[PDB]
């Protein structure tokens, strides 16, 4: 369920 710029605006949170 990997996070990218599409799901969140926070760079820290991307896999």
């Amino acid at each position: 369920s990997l996070l990218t710029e599409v799901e969140t605006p926070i760079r820290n949170e991307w896999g």
Partner: antibody
Amino acid sequence: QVQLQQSGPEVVRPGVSVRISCKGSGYTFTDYAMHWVKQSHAKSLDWIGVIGTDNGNTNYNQKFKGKATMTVDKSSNTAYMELGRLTSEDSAIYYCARRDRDDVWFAYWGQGTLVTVSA
Amino acid sequence: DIVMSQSPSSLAVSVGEKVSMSCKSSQSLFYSSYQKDLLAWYQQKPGQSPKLLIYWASTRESGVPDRFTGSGSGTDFTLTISSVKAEDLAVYFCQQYYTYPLTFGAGTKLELKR
């Protein structure tokens, strides 16, 4: 020399759709998503949504669900936004924009595309 | 959605004045992992796209004059111009990037007092 180059102005009849483009040059296209922003004349800015340039996945502001579609042609470094079934509320300048190297603040903007909805 | 409230909507200024404008978010924008607030400011003039001024609440973008200062943490943010110049007449917007959808304030427009 990051540049976001948008398509030119559009006059579109009510009830039809319009396809606008944003070509990213001077950088690695797939390393940054493309965001789109509406500015109604004399108004504020509204974020429409984001498309991953690498994965093609999208995330729309629920305010624009079913109004806006986003696509990308990676081979062309071009992102496209389709605005559907236009009404006079859709008349505005539309920008593409992208982040710098960190979180999603907009360091680079296209020059905007003017959409005027009229018969 | 995170509501960004800017005030005043318009401000009449005089060259050389210190100018202050407010941006309040309906939720905290503080992000612990960075120890920064996820807030940016923009300047926009007629006929142009917005230009980035400040990010993480207080870092000036390169090339932005040092008379622009961003401050605040949590919900209550301020953009200060220490000594306003005529070239600073524009609309200023704030934006949060804590979460989607991204959201902007309605702007503060600087006009000249007479």
